[PDB]
Amino acid sequence: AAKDVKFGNDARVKMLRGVNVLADAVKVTLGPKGRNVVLDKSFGAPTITKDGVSVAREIELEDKFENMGAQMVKEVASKANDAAGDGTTTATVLAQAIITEGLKAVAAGMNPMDLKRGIDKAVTAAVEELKALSVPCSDSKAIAQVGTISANSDETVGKLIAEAMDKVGKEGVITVEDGTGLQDELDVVEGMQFDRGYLSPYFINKPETGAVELESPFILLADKKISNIREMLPVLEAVAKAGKPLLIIAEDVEGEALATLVVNTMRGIVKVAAVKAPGFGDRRKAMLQDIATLTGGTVISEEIGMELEKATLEDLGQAKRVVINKDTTTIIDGVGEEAAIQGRVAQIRQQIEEATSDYDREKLQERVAKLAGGVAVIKVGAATEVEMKEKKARVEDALHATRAAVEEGVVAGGGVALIRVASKLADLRGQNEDQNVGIKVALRAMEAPLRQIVLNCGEEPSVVANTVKGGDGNYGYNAATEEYGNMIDMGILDPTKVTRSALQYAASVAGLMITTECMVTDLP
Amino acid sequence: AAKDVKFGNDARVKMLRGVNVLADAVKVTLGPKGRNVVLDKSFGAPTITKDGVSVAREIELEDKFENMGAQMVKEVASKANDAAGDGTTTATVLAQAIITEGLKAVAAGMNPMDLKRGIDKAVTAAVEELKALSVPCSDSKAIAQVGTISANSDETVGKLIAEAMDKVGKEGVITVEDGTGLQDELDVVEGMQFDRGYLSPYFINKPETGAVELESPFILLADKKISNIREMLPVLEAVAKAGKPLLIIAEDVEGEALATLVVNTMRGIVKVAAVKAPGFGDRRKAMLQDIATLTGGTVISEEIGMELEKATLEDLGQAKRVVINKDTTTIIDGVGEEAAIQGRVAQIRQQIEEATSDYDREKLQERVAKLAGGVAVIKVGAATEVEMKEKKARVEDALHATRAAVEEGVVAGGGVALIRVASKLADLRGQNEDQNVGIKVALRAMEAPLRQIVLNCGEEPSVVANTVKGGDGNYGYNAATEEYGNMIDMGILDPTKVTRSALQYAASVAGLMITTECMVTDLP
Amino acid sequence: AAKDVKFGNDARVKMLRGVNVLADAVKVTLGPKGRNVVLDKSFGAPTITKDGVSVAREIELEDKFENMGAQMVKEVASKANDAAGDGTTTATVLAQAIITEGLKAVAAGMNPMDLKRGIDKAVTAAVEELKALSVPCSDSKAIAQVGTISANSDETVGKLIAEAMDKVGKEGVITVEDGTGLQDELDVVEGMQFDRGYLSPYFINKPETGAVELESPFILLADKKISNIREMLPVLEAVAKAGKPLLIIAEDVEGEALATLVVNTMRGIVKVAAVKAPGFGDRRKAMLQDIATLTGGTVISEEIGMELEKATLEDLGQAKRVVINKDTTTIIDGVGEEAAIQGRVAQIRQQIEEATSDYDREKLQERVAKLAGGVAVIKVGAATEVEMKEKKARVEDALHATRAAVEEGVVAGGGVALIRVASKLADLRGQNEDQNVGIKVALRAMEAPLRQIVLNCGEEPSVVANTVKGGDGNYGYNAATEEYGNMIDMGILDPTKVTRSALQYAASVAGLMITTECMVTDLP
Ligand SMILES: Nc1ncnc2c1ncn2[C@@H]1O[C@H](COP(=O)(O)OP(=O)(O)OP(=O)(O)O)[C@@H](O)[C@H]1O
Ligand SMILES: Nc1ncnc2c1ncn2[C@@H]1O[C@H](COP(=O)(O)OP(=O)(O)OP(=O)(O)O)[C@@H](O)[C@H]1O
Ligand SMILES: Nc1ncnc2c1ncn2[C@@H]1O[C@H](COP(=O)(O)OP(=O)(O)OP(=O)(O)O)[C@@H](O)[C@H]1O
Ligand SMILES: [K+]
Ligand SMILES: [K+]
Ligand SMILES: [K+]
Ligand SMILES: [Mg+2]
Ligand SMILES: [Mg+2]
Ligand SMILES: [Mg+2]
C-alpha cells in the first residue's frame, strides 16, 4: 500500500513518543511499590498484572510511527521474558532511558552509529563487571530471598520455591499450575512416575484406595502393542514360578491378553498389572529405555532383535515398589545400576545441549528429573481467577528468577548492581567523542531502574540515586521499607542473569533505535 | 446562558490542568537560565518576553473549567506585577505549587477550609520571618546587584539604575523609555524643569543653540491668561529699572502682550522671556505654587486677591539661572527659602499618602522630584523593536526591584530566602491536623521557586534543594554559574518586598482555589 | 480568545519553518543573479520586486506558530529598510542563518541565553571590525560603483546618482519620482526655488514662455496676508523711485491689492510680481526667514514688531534674478551675507539633530538644500507601471546605498566583508562554552550572504566560500562574471553602514528568537 515516510527529528520524536507510551505503561509496575496494570481482553475478563512483558505485549498505538517505536521497544520486554523470565520491566526502563539519552545526543549532532558503538562497548564492559560482581546463590536462604523479591516481596512464594528446589535438587523439574484452594501447595514426586494409569480397574489390589500396590515386582517393558497371550505366556510362567508381582509397561494391552491377565490377577496365580507406555512415537521408546535403565531391565521390541516369547526373568526389570492409580504409575526404588543411570542421564544432558527447542529441552529435562532427582508442582492458591492469574505470573517470575540465580549468581537488587557497574565504568572510553557520549548515555541509563523504583515509591529519584552512588558495594535503598542499607543483608537480591539480560537486550534494541533517520509505514 | 456545572474531583482536576497550562507557560522564564516566551499579537509583531505576568495575561484556554483555573491563577501574576513590579514568575510558581499540594491534600479527604487556614497561618509566619531575615539595601553596590539580578544578570542595567538612584537621590523620580541608539542612556535633570517651551522663537538669546539663557532673572508667576500689556506694564517698568532679566510663567501669553514683549526683547530695554504654565486645571496651580516656593516668589491670580498691576519686585520670584528651549524650561538654583521648600515637599508627601491612584501619586512624586532631588530617564538601547520591548521590560523589572529593595531591604535570591523561612517554620502548627497539612503544603511550596530555577538550568531540583536546605543563612545555589555559595556574596539579591508579595498573593489565590468544590461556567 | 500553547522543540521547529518560508521567499532576490518575486495586490496589478523588504512584508502564514516565526523575522528586513534603505535581503539571510545555527545549538542542550550573549558579543566585535575595514567613499567613481551595485548592476542608475550627488553637493537633497519617458532623467535646481507660482497670470513678463522674469529685483517678505494697498503703498513708491523690479513673497495677496499691483505692472510704473509664501503655519515663517537670510532682507509681521507701512528699501531683500512660473518661483543669486546664510544653515542642522521624525528631518534637509547646495529629482524612465515600480525601487535602493556609503564608507561587496570580519574574529571567546558556540554560530552566519549569492548563481556555495576565505583583503567572487578578484577593483562595493545594520538587526532578532521555549498564539 501507499507509504508515509518521515525523516530525522520528526520521525525520531514520534518513535520516542511511542516508546514513552509503552514504557510509561510498563514502568508503573516496577519495584516493591509498583502498581498493577489492567489489560482488556476481547474474550474474557480483564487481566490484572504486574509483569512488564504482558503490558508491553498489549501495547499498540494508533499513530503508525509511534506504534513503530512501541513495537520496536516491545522486543526488549519480549526477549527478557523469553531469556530470563524476569526483569522485563527493568529491561524496558533501561531501553527507554537509553533511547531518550541517545536521541538527545543525536539531536546534538553526534553520529548515531558511533553512539550505538559506545553503548555496545559500555554494555559489554557492564556485563563483564556484573559477572565480576556476582556472588553464588546456592543456600536455601538466598534462593528464598530471590524468589520473595521476584514475587513482589511475597515471602511465602520464595519459601515454597526454595523448599521445592531443595526437595527436587539440582536435576529436578519444577512447574507452576493453578490450584483449587486459597493456599499455595507444593507436590513433590520423587523417582519415576509417568501419567499412565492401569489398563483395567480390576487390577486394583487395594480397593479402599483404588490403587494397585506391588511389592518388589518384576518389570516387563514391551515396545510393541500386546493383544494375545501366546507371546507373553512364558514370561507369565516364569513370574508365577518366582512368585513376585509383575508390572507390564507396554505400548498397548487389550483384548484377550488383558482379559486373561485380569483373570489370573483374581485367581492369585500371578499378581500382575498392565500400564500403557508413556509418551508417543520416537519419544515413548526413550522413556521405556529410561525405565529399563532405572529398573535394570531390557525393552522388548522388533527392532532390538528379540521377541516377547524368549523373554526371561533376567530380561525383566526390578523395582522395590510399584503404585498404579487411575491416571499415574509410580516406580519406587528401581533395582538398577547407579552407573548406568548416571550415564543415561549424561546422555540426555548431551541431547539437551544439542536440543534447539524450549519445549523439547523441557521434555528431556523432565525425563532427567524422572530418572534422577524429582518433579515438583506448585499449585497456586487464590480465591478468584484474576487473583490466580496475577499470583501465578508472580510465582512463575519467582521460579525463573531463582533458576537464573542458581545458574549465574546474584547481585544487589533495587538497581544497585547497575549503579555500581556504571560507577566502575566511569573511565571507559571509545574511539571518538561520539562513542564516549554513547558510553555516557549507557552509564546514565544504568541508573534508570533504581530511579524508577524510587519514583514508584513517591520519593525523589535523584536524591536516592545520589545517596546510593555515594555508597559502595551492596549499599542501596530498600524501597519497601524506604531505608538505606546492605541489599544483600535485607535480602533484596537480583539474579545476575536477569540484570545482564535486561541490560543487553535493552542496549541492543535501543542502540539500533537511536540510529534511525527515516521511518516508512502505512498511510493512515 | 445555559451553564455547565462540575463538582469535586472532576472540577478540581480541570482547574488544576488549566493552572498547570498557565504555570507551565510562565515557569520556563524563571531564573538566570529561564528562556523566553513568544506571545502572538493580532495587530503587530509577536512579543518576546521573559516577564511571567505578560505570559500569564496572554493565557486563555478553550476548555471553560481549565480556563477558569488559568484565569484565577493569572491574578497572582497580575497582583505581583501591580504591587512589586517583579516576582510574577515566582508568584505563579508558588501559586501552582500551593494549588497542587493543596489539591493533593483535598483528594486525601482533609477539610479545604482548614487547609486554607493553615496556608494563611504559614504565610503570615513566613512574612514575619522574611521581615526578620531582610537586611537593608542602601549602598550603590547592593542596588546595582539587585538591578542586575532583576534584569536577568544584566550588569549594565543594574549599574545604570544604581547611578540613576545616586544622581536623583531618595526623592528623585526615575522613568524608563525607548531610546534611539543601541546603548542604554541615562538623562538626569536636576532642580525644576517643566515641558513648556518659549511662547515665541524670537525670545532666543543664543541663536547658535536656539535657547533663551537668562542669568539671575526675575520670575513672574501668573495664574491667569495674559493678552494685554496694561496689567503687566508696571512689572516691566520695575524689571527694566532693576536691569535683571525676566521670565514669565503664565497660563497663556498671546496677542499684543506677546508682541510688545518681543519688541522689548530685541530693543534691549528688558531681556524678557514668556513660557506657558505647566499642567492643567487644578494641577497647574500646584506647579505654579511649587515654582513660587522654589524661587521665593508669589503667584498672581484673581482668587488669591491681588492683580498683576500691583505686582512689585518683591512679588517676583528669583533664580540663579533660567534656560528655555523649544520644548522645556529649566530653572537652576531658584533663590527660595529651604525651609519653605521642605515644608511644601512634606505637604506633597502628605497628599501622596492621601492619594489613592497610581497615576496621581506618580504625578505628585514627579512634583516632589522637581522641587527637590532630580528626574532621571533611562533610554533603552536596542537594535530592533522586539529587542527594545524585551530590554525595556527587563529594565522596568530592575527599576521596580531596586525601588522595592530600597524600601524593604533584600534577602538571599534564587529561592533561598523562602527555603530558609520554610525551614524556620517547621515547628509551626495549626488548630487541627488539616491546618497542619496546610502549613506543610505552604512550606513545601516555598521550595518551588528554587526547584524551578534549578530545573530551568537542566540540573536536578531535588538534589540542589536538599543541598541548599542542608546549608544555613545565605548559602544557596548560583544557577548562572551552577555553583554553591553565599548568595549575598555573589550578588544574587532578591527584594524582600518582591518575595513577600509573591508569597502572599500566591497564598491568597491558591488557598481560595483549593477550597473549591463546584464550578459553574458557560456551556461550550 | 482561546490560546494554542507550544513548547520546546515543537514550537521552535514551527518558528524555524515560518522563518524558512519567509527567508526562502526573500533570498531568491539576493545578488546580481537574484531573481524577482511577484507579490499579489488585492487592489491593482501584481508587483514585481527584487527588494527583500517588500517580499518579507507580503509574507504571512496560515499556521499560527509558523506565522509567528515569519512575522518575527520580518522585523529584520523592516528595520534594515528603515535604517539603511538597503541590505534587507542580506539582513534576512543573516537572520535565517543565525536562527538555524542557534536552534541547532539549542537542540544540542546549550543555554539559549548564553548563545544569544555570544552572538551579541560576536556581532559587536564584527561591527568594530567592519568599522576598521571600511574605507571612505568620496570620489564620484566609487559612488557610481555603489549605486550600480545597489541597483542590481545598473550602470546608468549609478552614474546618474553620482552626477546628482556631484551637482547638489554634500548638503543637497535628492529624491526619486516617476518619469514620463523611457529614460531616467535628472533635474537639478540650485539656489532657492519653492513651489509657489504667481498670484496672477497677468504678471507674466515673457508671454512666449509664460514666466515672470525680474532682473535684480527687490524682495518684499510679508508674513501676513495682504488685501489692501495702503499698507504696501510706501514700499511701492520707494520701489518705483528706485526703478528696480519687486517680488512680494506674502502669505496671501488678493482683492484690491492684487488688482492695483496688476494695473501698475502693465502701466510700467513698477514691474512687480506677487507670490504666496511657501509652507504652512509654524513652517512658512521658517522658509520666509530662510529667504530673507538668502536675499539679505527682513520679514514683515505683527510679532516681529514693525508693519508694512514703515517698510523701507533697506528692509526689502535683494536678489540677482527671479523667475516665476505657474507653479514654482526661483530666486537666483540672492544678495545676502554668506556668514548669515552659513549660520542659519548650521542652526537648521542643529534642529535636524534635535529632530525626532524622518518626515520633519527631511523637510529641514530640503530647507538646507534650498539655502545652500541644490535639490535633485531623478525621474525614473520605464515603459510600463510594473517596470516603473521595479526600477524606482532599485533606484531608491541605490540612492540609500550611496548616501550610506558617503556617510560611513565602503567595504568589499558580495559578502566578502562579512567573510573577512568573521575570519578576524576566530579567536573571540565568551564567558562560557555556550557563549563560544553563540560566537561560532554568528561567525558561520556571517558567511550566509556570500553563500546565498553564489547559490543564486547556480554555483557551489561551499567551494566559492572556501576560495574566498582562503584569500585575504578585498579578494572575493564576482558573481556577475563568476570570477575571482579584488571586489574594490571590479567595483563591487557594499556600504559599511548597510552591512553593519543588516548584521546588527539580524543578530538582535535572531538572538532573541533562539531563546524562545514557549509560544502562545490564537487557536485555529
Ligand atoms: N524491597 C525492595 N527494595 C528495593 N528494590 C526492590 C525491592 N524489591 C524488589 N526490588 C527491585 O525491583 C526490581 C524488580 O521489580 P519488578 O519485579 O516489578 O520488575 P522486573 O523484574 O524488571 O520485571 P517483571 O515485570 O518481568 O517482573 C528489581 O530490580 C529488584 O531488585
Ligand atoms: N544567578 C542566579 N542564581 C540563582 N538564582 C538567580 C540568579 N539570578 C536570578 N536568580 C533568581 O531568579 C529569580 C528571578 O527570576 P525571574 O526574573 O525570571 O522571575 P520573577 O522575578 O519571579 O518574575 P518576573 O517574570 O516578573 O521577572 C529570583 O528568585 C532570583 O533570586
Ligand atoms: N557582481 C556582483 N558580484 C558579487 N556580489 C555582488 C555583485 N553585485 C552585487 N553583489 C552583492 O549582492 C548584495 C546585494 O544584493 P541585493 O541588492 O539583492 O540584496 P540586499 O542589498 O541584501 O537587499 P535589498 O533587497 O534591500 O536590495 C551585496 O552583498 C553586494 O555586494
Ligand atoms: K514489574
Ligand atoms: K521570568
Ligand atoms: K534583493
Ligand atoms: Mg520481576
Ligand atoms: Mg524578575
Ligand atoms: Mg540591495
Swiss-Prot record, chains A, B, C:
One example of a Gene Ontology biological process annotation: response to radiation
Modified sites of kind N6-succinyllysine: 33, 50, 116, 276, 320, 389
Residues holding ATP: 29-32, 50, 86-90, 414, 478-480, 494
Modifications made to the protein after synthesis: Phosphorylated reversibly during heat shock. Can be UMPylated on a tyrosine residue by SelO/YdiU, probably under stress conditions.
Xref: InterPro entries: Chaperonin_Cpn60_CS, Cpn60/GroEL, Cpn60/GroEL/TCP-1, GroEL-like_apical_dom_sf, GROEL-like_equatorial_sf, TCP-1-like_intermed_sf
CC per GO annotation: cytosol; GroEL-GroES complex; membrane
EC number annotated for this UniProt entry: 5.6.1.7
Keywords: Acetylation, ATP-binding, Chaperone, Cytoplasm, Isomerase, Nucleotide-binding
Chief location bin: cytoplasm
Superkingdom: Bacteria
Catalytic EC class: isomerase
Keyword Acetylation appears in the UniProt entry: yes
Localization annotation: Cytoplasm
Modified residues (N6-acetyllysine): 116
Reactions that this protein is recorded to catalyse: ATP + H2O + a folded polypeptide = ADP + phosphate + an unfolded polypeptide
An example molecular function term from Gene Ontology annotations: ATP hydrolysis activity
Regulation: During the substrate-folding cycle, the two GroEL rings separate for effective substrate binding and chaperonin activity. Ring separation is triggered by ATP binding to the trans ring of the asymmetric GroEL:GroES complex and avoids formation of functionally impaired symmetric GroEL:GroES2 complexes. Activity of the GroEL-GroES chaperonin complex requires Mg-ATP. UMPylation of the chaperone by SelO/YdiU negatively regulates its activity, and may facilitate survival under stress conditions.
Its job: Together with its co-chaperonin GroES, plays an essential role in assisting protein folding. The GroEL-GroES system forms a nano-cage that allows encapsulation of the non-native substrate proteins and provides a physical environment optimized to promote and accelerate protein folding, probably by preventing aggregation and by entropically destabilizing folding intermediates.
Quaternary organization: Forms a cylinder of 14 subunits composed of two heptameric rings stacked back-to-back. Interacts with the co-chaperonin GroES. Can form asymmetrical complexes, composed of one GroEL and one GroES, and symmetrical complexes, formed between one GroEL and two GroES oligomers. The asymmetrical complex is the functional unit. It was suggested that the symmetric heterooligomer may represent a transient intermediate in the chaperonin protein folding cycle.
Protein family: Belongs to the chaperonin (HSP60) family.
Domain notes: Each subunit is composed of an apical domain that binds non-folded proteins and GroES, an intermediate domain and an equatorial domain that binds ATP and is involved in inter-ring interactions. Forms a large central channel that appears to traverse the entire length of the cylinder with no obstruction. The central channel of GroEL functions as two cavities, one in each ring, that are separated from each other by the crystallographically disordered 23-amino-acid C-terminal segments of the seven subunits. The entry and exit of polypeptide seem to be restricted to the apical end of each ring. Modulating the volume of the GroEL central cavity affects folding speed in accordance with confinement theory. Small proteins fold more rapidly as the size of the cage is gradually reduced to a point where restriction in space slows folding dramatically. For larger proteins, either expanding or reducing cage volume decelerate folding. A stepwise reduction in cage size results in a gradual loss of cell viability.
Protein name: Chaperonin GroEL
Gene source species: Escherichia coli (strain K12)
